[PDB]
Amino acid sequence: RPITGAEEGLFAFITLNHLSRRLGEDPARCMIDEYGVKQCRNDLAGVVEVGGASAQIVFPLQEGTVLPSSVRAVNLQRERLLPERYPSADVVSVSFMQLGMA
Amino acid sequence: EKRINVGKKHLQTLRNLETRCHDSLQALVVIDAGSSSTRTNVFLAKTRSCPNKGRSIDPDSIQLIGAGKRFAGLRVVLEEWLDTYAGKDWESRPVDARLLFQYVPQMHEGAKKLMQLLEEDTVAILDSQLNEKQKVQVKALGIPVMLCSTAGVRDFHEWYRDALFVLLRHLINNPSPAHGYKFFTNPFWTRPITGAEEGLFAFITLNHLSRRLGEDPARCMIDEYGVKQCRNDLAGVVEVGGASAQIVFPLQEGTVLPSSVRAVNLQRERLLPERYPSADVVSVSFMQLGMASSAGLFLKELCSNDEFLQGGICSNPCLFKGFQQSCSAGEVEVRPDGSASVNEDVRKNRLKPLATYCSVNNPEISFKVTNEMQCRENSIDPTKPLAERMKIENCSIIKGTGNFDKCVSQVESILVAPKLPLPANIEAASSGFESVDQVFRFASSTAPMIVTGGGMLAAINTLKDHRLLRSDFSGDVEELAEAAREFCSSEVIIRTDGPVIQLPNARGEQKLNSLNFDLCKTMALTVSLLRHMAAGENQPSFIKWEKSIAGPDGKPLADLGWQVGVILHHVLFTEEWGRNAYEAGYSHNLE
Amino acid sequence: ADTEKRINVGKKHLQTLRNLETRCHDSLQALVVIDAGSSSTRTNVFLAKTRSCPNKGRSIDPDSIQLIGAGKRFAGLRVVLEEWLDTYAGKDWESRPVDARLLFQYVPQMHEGAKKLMQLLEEDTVAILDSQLNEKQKVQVKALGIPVMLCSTAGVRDFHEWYRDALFVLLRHLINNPSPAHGYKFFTNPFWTRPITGAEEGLFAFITLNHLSRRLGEDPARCMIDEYGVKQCRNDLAGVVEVGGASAQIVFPLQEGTVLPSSVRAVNLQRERLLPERYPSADVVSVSFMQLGMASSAGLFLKELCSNDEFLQGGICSNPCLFKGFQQSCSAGEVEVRPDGSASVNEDVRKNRLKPLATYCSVNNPEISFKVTNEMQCRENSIDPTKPLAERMKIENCSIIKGTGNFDKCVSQVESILVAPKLPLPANIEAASSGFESVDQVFRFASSTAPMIVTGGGMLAAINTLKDHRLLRSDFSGDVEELAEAAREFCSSEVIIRTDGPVIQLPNARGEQKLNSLNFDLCKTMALTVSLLRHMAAGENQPSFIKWEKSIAGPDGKPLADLGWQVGVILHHVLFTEEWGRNAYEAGYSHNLE
Ligand SMILES: [Cl-]
């Protein structure tokens, strides 16, 4: 099937993290939230990819950050990109056709 | 021998009692913390306790039993607290918010007096509406309270509102033990809601009460994989409130919006559970179309236009011939003598919400690059200090000209189809359109539309009371324009008993007051909205003006608005509701 | 300068309030377990800590469960049914076949019978709550509601009509309608209040033991990897031997890698919905022996011993399990030792210790009827199913029983009559039972290395009597020969009549103790102990240790609750978080609103 620039960014983010051994069932840190619920995450690295047609920037949302209402973290489990057994991954995902090489 | 059957039947009766579901009455309270007032809303619901299945609410049973007195708005609590501890010029000068942490008990002090008035009013409603048997059930189950703030408390941009909500929930969770009503809340039920969220909840209220929203779908489509894709036959809502206007309607079947705007999916937003057919909607909320902001913005743009402003006189076509006032967007008070009194206080300026929104102090303006330009180009300059930002230059008097068609053409250019709209940042509950014109030109639907809001209904009822519009009026644009043109050509006559609106050809009159002097602008907004809806590729199957919905019997079940929808979004998620309302319950407050 | 102090106080105050609305809140709850046994109905009052968490509902902390009070012994449920059947089914209802269909005319009279007992239990439960709780505790207890679990063990199992089911419907109705004056909101449902079998009683007593001793928990003690590469986990659970008044239960963990015969099965506590899935898997050998109860073994022992040519001679039964100088009328009736040293035997059919086994061993019992061998298995245990009741229990050609105090002969007869009979009584194959028929079969095919806890009033008195006369060392750890030598000496005692009453006088002037209705036949319990230990010692796998326990010490040293089925019953409900939350809190006492 065809894939968009933003989807190409998320897939490149998954590639980087898999090969770097950052993505996996073992989280790098678990935090006890306001309710006493253990929230676990991998120590994911962000990616800056400047391709021929577009530039993608994908990185995990800063822990305890409140984004403007007008933008949103992309949840990889919600988008069916990562299974539920993987620690929750919330990312800032951006694709700019104007920053591509061409 | 027939004595055996009495015994066998008695045992079966008792066996039926311990195996079947049992019904019990529950009260639920929604506190509407609006811009100008805070009002309690008391509801009744039938709960069902089923062996090994817990306890749930029958959503069809939700009924309003009483709406109370309008107490002061939450904004008053904060404004009085800021006046005392930050200094009287906090609206017009920089404030060190950190220093205000010294005065948290004084903020609690302000919230306590208001909560005590609401608690007494709620108890008064319960006692007057319930019989002794109903009271026993109601007192036993506990009373969930959902206090939601809407407009008036969104523009402080510090720690105040969140701290105020912590204090309000603490107050709700400590009711007086004397009356026996076990009120209780949690941070999921008592919280601020946005304008677009009020829209979604009003949409859910309308469809629930009219019986259009239900588990059983109206129609299904079979996809390429043989899977049923089902939907309900939902009605849209147009709500013009005092602080904002919302438009929410189902996305036209078989359409997809481009990557610049988005349909809101009620299930994805966790407003409706997955067992309800998928509901995709076009959702918009515009502060500038609320009754108060639209009045201020209309004057700000009309009175800076060379066609209307000449030699310090602003000729306003939406105001009656014979009416005049001083030139400012200040709150107008129609006096006993017939003159208009304009309040010049920054706090009472109709432009205050838009000017506070269109500011460099507002982080929302920095969220999107064009925001500041869209403010400036609509005559609300973020670079100008507050008083200069709201001022109408080279203008001493506003005089009414009673020209309905000119009023409509100006509502078109300032409010409905502006060349450059004011900024509206998208949020999870909204579609991203910034203008009503764009909504109907690009995302029109065949779904029926219900027009709601106090002022919208007052505009139609005024024309029907004067017998200028037929009682069976059903939305015809030209019939409405004709009625409104005649009413708006009325002359203001000052008499011994006060000012009157005298209809042409001695066809009646009514008293002129602070609430109706500018009603022609609402009639013009209605004509303009109907015109845009009629010019859409898809037109609503019908259009109606409503305040409430009749139940299966004929009596009103509840009022239109966001309140029923707020309850439903909690009660419909069965497992979560059972845990919070019954397992934790009021007993969570035990010390 | 001190402005920062006032700022930080304001900030802290808001953080204190925010924490208060995001964290779990604790609250006390009372729980009631009504123990409806064979000869009595008694209330048991418990306290537990509940935890209410945002978006999570409310649950009980299982380690907080504590007994606050046990009530008075009121009449047994069998007494309620017999008084109702004595009034409306006339006389000889248990002699002549009765038309049960006609008894439906007398349902309000059954209700009145049950109302009298329930009012007594409700008053007693309220008395315990009022004496044990302070005012702050009462507010919490009254607001949450009081779950009541009434379970009947032995007594009411044998009517074979609609009576028991009807009684239970009436009992729950009474429990669900408590007096509003006291403010205690008692309530029940058909899942909490119901009869329980002997095998289910064993599983509940096994759960109680392992809970109190901190062996049962979510975290496993050890994990293993099977043939497929799957991690298999378990707790290090202790087995229980509970010798009750009506039956004996043996419940212990299945030894790792055991291949059981096709005809018996391990009981899986998770599959049986006794423990949730979050607990490590627990597979057990579960056995309930009808003839090994204090009452039933006493009856059967006399029936078999006193029909054997070696012991019955010219109307005199020489009993090796009774003291020299002791004598009684020849019947299985309840015995009362009187101040002059004489024995009074109650001849009432309802007080005959052979009655439950004789009604069990009937052609009218489907358990017996459905299998050809079953009827013969009863007959070989001296209880003939074709015989009428009173004749079925009679010890023929026998006038008196005289004690001979010969421990070795007592062990030999206990072994051949009770523990390893020529023909065992029929196997029970209900879900809670592994389907074993004898003690030897259990230790031959399913022996385990799990430690074993011996419980039951009579089992403990058998060991403590020997320790008290310094015949057994205080450090006794289960050695068979050490026990047999001690019991041989004690069991050789002579009954002597003094001014103060009858005494058991030990040989070689070692001392004495008062002879009474509870200890006159204790030597048979000493012989049952020797026999049980011998069968366990002959197993391929040996328990790591064997201990006799009256109670289990809590974290603070003092016991939190009693051994027995009561704690286990609470746990099998409270551990199922979602189900408990729905029944106890969502439905609750408000389900009773009318
Ligand atoms: Cl737009």
Curated annotation (Swiss-Prot), chain C:
E.C. designation(s): 3.6.1.15
Gene3D superfamilies, sorted: 3.30.420.530, 3.30.420.540
Catalytic residues (positions): E201 (proton acceptor)
Primary site of residence: secreted
Pfam families: GDA1_CD39
Glycosylated sites: N397
InterPro entries for this protein: GDA1_CD39_NTPase (IPR000407), NTPase_alveloata (IPR017227)
Record-level GO cellular component terms: membrane; symbiont-containing vacuole
Keyword set includes Glycoprotein: yes
Family: Belongs to the GDA1/CD39 NTPase family.
Known partners and oligomeric status: Homotetramer.
Descriptive protein name: Nucleoside-triphosphatase 1
Lineage, uppermost ranks: Eukaryota, Sar, Alveolata, Apicomplexa, Conoidasida
Protein encoded by which gene: NTP3
